[PDB]
Amino acid sequence: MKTQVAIIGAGPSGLLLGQLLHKAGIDNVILERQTPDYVLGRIRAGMLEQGMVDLLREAGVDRRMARDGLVHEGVEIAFAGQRRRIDLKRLSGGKTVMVYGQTEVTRDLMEAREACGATTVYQAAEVRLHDLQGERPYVTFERDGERLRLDCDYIAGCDGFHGISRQSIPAERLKVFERVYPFGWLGLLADTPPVSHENIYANHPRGFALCSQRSATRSRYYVQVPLTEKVEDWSDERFWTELKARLPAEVAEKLVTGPSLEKSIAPLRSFVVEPMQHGRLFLAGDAAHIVPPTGAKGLNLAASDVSTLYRLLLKAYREGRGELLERYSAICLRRIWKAERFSWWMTSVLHRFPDTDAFSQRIQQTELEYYLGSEAGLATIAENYVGLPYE
């Protein structure tokens, strides 16, 4: 097989890059280890920045999102008996966020890719990269018993955190920045109407809680839990009871509960690798970095990475200077770290940390009081929440 850009992974990163390159005229093929049904089996929600929204329109996959998508002009933070709404639209200057799940985005992208007949190879196992600093890089994999080879000019590592792409770079070339938080999120997806038309973050002494949406008949809730916890010790019953205890009464009153469609515990991690590339290999999305989901930034960061790689690959294949591709890591990392900072801040002020002292609690409380009580403070949250202007 011959292509111009070999893409590893058919997640939202790889698919979006694939479709963007398609419109541009750049040949590309995607290799996915799992099956389409499995990738779509991944039930992850989604809050979208306008940057990602507009990027889906440019890729031509905006029709269904324009229909099923839900716009939020604001978001709520609850703490210390208070409920404070952040007017995102007003504070950021017209900008908003979009409720549209990653599962839907991934579906939409697949449909556009199948519809246009672009190349995608699922069940591609033992994926291995070759000659990365060489001039004829190539990929090798096995499906249906046969061993194939995909020749290429460039390789896009969009194979997520546990992908082979990052592990294909010599470790001596990479520096890893990592923070593991002492808690996880116990999440529950239910076929119930959301308690609020905007999302609600809650800092409660018992722990963090989050009320979120998917459709308008499907809700997504989280409560922070210790990593000592196992999902089997948490009935739907126990979940709703804890969630209600961590919410304002006037919210818990209005809360429609129900059976769990999905119930899982997710650990919170920060992760960044520098640089994000090696020769003809470019990492994007979870392959390069992880954020705690408190900021809802991982998928949006994946988008910005892909947007940068797409536009550099354009100026490369067109203007014959595949040298601007050296600027990939520096450009992405500037935005990645700003996302890591906000996601870290959000996590730091909304969660309860073990073995913290009285001073830390008061500082956390004062952080919320100041930033939610100041027009400037509110603006710093808002502009980060909707997404800072692209680079």
Alpha carbon 93 to its chain's center: 24
The pairing of strands 28-31 and 119-121 is: parallel
Q: Per rule CB under 6 A, is residue 220 in the interface with ligand A1LXW?
A: yes
> At residue 30, what are phi and psi to the nearest 5 degrees?
-105, 135
Work out which of 21, 26, 29, 45 binds ligand A1LXW, going by CB under 6 A: 45
Work out which of 184, 293, 298, 387 binds ligand A1LXW, going by CB under 6 A: 293
Say which entry of ligand FAD, ligand A1LXW, none residue 294 contacts (CB below 5 to 8 A, set by partner kind). ligand A1LXW
Q: Which residue out of 221, 297, 310, 317 is catalytically annotated?
A: 297
Interacting residues toward ligand FAD by CB under 6 A? 8-14, 31-34, 39, 44-47, 102, 124, 127, 158-160, 162-164, 187, 266, 285-286, 293, 296-300, 302
- Which CB sits closer to ligand FAD, 244 or 269? 269
Q: Rounded distance, CA 219 to CA 159, Å? A: 28
Least distance in angstroms from the C-beta of 343 to ligand A1LXW: 9
CA angle 62, 68, 70 (to 5 degrees): 100
Work out which of 19, 165, 260, 294 binds ligand A1LXW, going by CB under 6 A: 294
Q: Rounded distance, CA 243 to CA 266, Å? A: 16
Q: Rounded distance, CA 319 to CA 296, Å? A: 36
Say which entry of ligand A1LXW, ligand FAD, none residue 127 contacts (CB below 5 to 8 A, set by partner kind). ligand FAD
Q: Rounded distance, CA 285 to CA 158, Å? A: 6
- Which CB sits closer to ligand FAD, 207 or 293? 293
Q: Per rule CB under 6 A, is residue 384 in the interface with ligand A1LXW?
A: no
Least distance in angstroms from the C-beta of 299 to ligand FAD: 3
Q: Is 201 a catalytic residue?
A: yes
- Which CB sits closer to ligand A1LXW, 70 or 121? 70
Say which entry of ligand FAD, ligand A1LXW, none residue 220 contacts (CB below 5 to 8 A, set by partner kind). ligand A1LXW
Q: Rounded distance, CA 186 to CA 257, Å? A: 16
- Which CB sits closer to ligand A1LXW, 141 or 342? 342
Say which entry of ligand A1LXW, ligand FAD, none residue 248 contacts (CB below 5 to 8 A, set by partner kind). none
> At residue 111, what are phi and psi to the nearest 5 degrees?
-60, -40
For 156, 205, 325, 360, 390, the CA distances from 335, given in Å and listed in that order, are: 19, 32, 17, 29, 8
Six-digit token string for 123: 């069940």
Q: Is 385 a catalytic residue?
A: yes
Least distance in angstroms from the C-beta of 122 to ligand A1LXW: 26
Least distance in angstroms from the C-beta of 306 to ligand FAD: 9
Q: Is 72 a catalytic residue?
A: yes
- Which CB sits closer to ligand FAD, 29 or 127? 127
- Which CB sits closer to ligand FAD, 144 or 355? 144
Alpha carbon 130 to its chain's center: 28
Q: Which residue out of 248, 293, 317, 328 is catalytically annotated?
A: 293
Q: Transcribe 93-120 into DSSP letters.
A: TS--EEE--HHHHHHHHHHHHHHTT-EE
Q: Which residue out of 201, 221, 310, 328 is catalytically annotated?
A: 201
Answer whether 382's CB lies under 8 Å from 86's CB.
yes
Q: Which residue out of 100, 138, 310, 385 is catalytically annotated?
A: 385
Six-digit token string for 103: 């599962």
Return the residue matching tokens 């291995």. 128
Q: Is 297 a catalytic residue?
A: yes
Answer whether 269's CB lies under 8 Å from 292's CB.
yes
Least distance in angstroms from the C-beta of 199 to ligand A1LXW: 5
Q: Of 78, 79, 97, nearest to 87 (Cα)?
A: 97
Q: Of 194, 165, 383, nearest to 277 (Cα)?
A: 165
> Could you list the active site residues?
72, 201, 293, 297, 385
